[PDB]
Ligand binder design. Structure first.
Ligand SMILES: Cc1ncsc1-c1ccc(CNC(=O)[C@@H]2C[C@@H](O)CN2C(=O)[C@@H](NC(=O)C2(F)CC2)C(C)(C)C)c(OCCOCC[NH+]2CCN(Cc3cn4c5cccc(Br)c5c(=O)nc4n3C)CC2)c1
Lengths: 150, 115, 87, 104
């Protein structure tokens, strides 16, 4: 424990439905009791699974291959509440509306190797943007800051 | 020096091999997660709650070093493994659900092999 | 409805909604109706206008978000346009 | 049920949306508001086929799977000139360069 974004050791079971409604292979990521990310089995495009979690447990979803961030119920993070009368809680994993600059960045990353990012005819500014690959840790630093700032 | 006869150690590991090698309709080996307990560094919350931790590696070691003197003593620890899994993971969990079927696979195997 | 004209380097005029063209930060600055782009060609500027429609339609939307497609041949020029237009 | 289009004539391209139940005549009124040519001075096409004023966008073939925001359907436009109508001419966009070795 101690980081702001971490799962609470509640010991209160919560039944969640993970539904992948994106064209990406989804990687569910669970933040453990010390706020460290843990990978879980992947969900192919269009697949849905009934999974077992607990109250106050933090989740985030990424592209399994590229590590691009995804939305769950139109937002970054997912925390399941209590099962009201044994009803399952639904986690709808969708694709965010990426910025055209970030979406262009993804497509060129999938076609070019990391060693050949400097070989392109693009400006100096875009080499650093292209080398800044998306990861769970940087988006956590941005989120821990955002909710601590709020 | 050797407190258990050869036929007792033979039938003890015959029952545990049936529980370890058991597979459901899907073809998934239920025992997989129960073979190795996670370290205190990995899951410190497991040791805070469970007072007598046990896995299938320590159960096969306890058959090899002659700690259990009967089939009842072996069951004592296989049921403890399942109750620790149920107590820690709670109702609904796949680990909780896998523990219940592994308990019946041990009892039906003890009924089969012994008598 | 309020519209704006966006002209490419090769002379193609793209008439898009003002609210749609406001997606880009650079267009927001120069626009307060016409806007010229001497370094963005027509095939890139038409794809930027298709992003503005995709942006406004799926942002803060409960319908399923589809993938925005970018062909390998247009990916580089579209990246330079996106960086220059801030969208 | 919305349909996302590209109304094209010569080097002009209008980006607009319309309902699938909307008619071709109602789309000609949208072009009148933008380019100030009345519907009687217009001809709309899907490829080389002329579109009827009374037919809906869905009946012409423009549906949500074939006219998406990110990949809109093209609607050919030709204006009246003198007495007769001009030939449908859509000036194509410029071609992208050769795909580099780094991407190949
Ligand atoms: C199908 C699918 N598709 C997309 S995601 C998904 C999915 C989602 C969830 C689960 C299983 N559920 C969980 O792992 C939940 C989700 C999240 O909420 C955290 N979590 C937990 O269960 C945690 N548990 C909790 O918080 C509590 F139990 C309330 C305290 C979490 C992560 C476990 C700390 C899953 O399944 C598959 C196996 O995954 C299990 C992962 N390991 C097992 C070993 N265990 C380590 C481990 C080894 N062992 C033993 C070893 C030997 C003998 C025994 Br007797 C045990 C034993 O008894 N228990 C354990 N464990 C636990 C650590 C966790 C697949």
């Amino acid at each position: 424990p101690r980081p702001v974004l971490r799962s609470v050791n509640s010991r209160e079971p919560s039944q969640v439905i993970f539904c992948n409604r994106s064209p990406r292979v989804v990687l569910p990521v669970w933040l453990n009791f010390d706020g460290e990310p843990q990978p879980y089995p992947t969900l192919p495009p269009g697949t849905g699974r009934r999974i077992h979690s607990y109250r106050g447990h933090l989740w985030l979803f990424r592209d399994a291959g590229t590590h691009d961030g995804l939305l769950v119920n139109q937002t970054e993070l997912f925390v399941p509440s209590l099962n009201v009368d044994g009803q399952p809680i639904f986690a709808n994993i969708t694709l965010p509306v990426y910025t055209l600059k970030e979406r262009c960045l993804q497509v060129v990353r999938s076609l070019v190797k990391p060693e050949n990012y400097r070989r392109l005819d693009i400006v100096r500014s875009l080499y650093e943007d292209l080398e800044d690959h998306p990861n769970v840790q940087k988006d956590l630093e941005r989120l821990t800051q955002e909710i601590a700032h709020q | 020096l050797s407190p258990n006869p050869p036929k007792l150690t033979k039938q003890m590991n015959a029952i545990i091999d049936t529980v370890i090698n058991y597979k459901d309709s899907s073809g998934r080996q239920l025992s997989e997660v129960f073979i190795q307990l996670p370290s205190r560094k990995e899951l410190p919350e497991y040791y805070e709650l469970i007072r007598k931790p046990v896995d299938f590696k320590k159960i096969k070691e306890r058959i090899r070093n002659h700690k259990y003197r009967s089939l009842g003593d072996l069951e004592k620890d296989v049921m403890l493994l399942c109750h620790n899994a149920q107590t820690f993971n709670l109702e609904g969990s796949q680990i909780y659900e896998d523990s219940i079927v592994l308990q019946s696979v041990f009892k039906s195997a003890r009924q089969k092999i012994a008598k | 409805m309020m519209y704006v004209k966006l002209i490419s380097s090769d002379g193609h005029e793209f008439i898009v909604k003002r609210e749609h063209a406001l997606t880009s930060g650079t267009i927001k600055a120069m626009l307060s109706n016409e806007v010229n782009f001497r370094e963005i060609p027509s095939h890139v500027l038409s794809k930027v206008c298709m992003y503005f429609t995709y942006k406004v339609r799926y942002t803060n939307s409960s319908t399923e978000i589809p993938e925005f497609p970018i062909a390998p041949e247009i990916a580089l020029e579209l990246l330079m346009a996106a960086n220059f237009l801030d969208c | 049920m919305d349909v996302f289009l590209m109304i094209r004539r010569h080097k002009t391209t209008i980006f607009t949306d319309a309902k699938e139940s909307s008619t071709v005549f109602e789309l000609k009124r949208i072009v009148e508001g933008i380019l100030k040519r009345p519907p009687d001075e217009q001809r709309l096409y899907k490829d080389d086929q002329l579109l009827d004023d009374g037919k809906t966008l869905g009946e012409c073939g423009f549906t949500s799977q074939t006219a998406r925001p990110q990949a809109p359907a093209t609607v050919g436009l030709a204006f009246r000139a003198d007495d007769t109508f001009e030939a449908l001419c859509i000036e194509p966009f410029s071609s992208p360069p050769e795909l580099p070795d780094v991407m190949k």
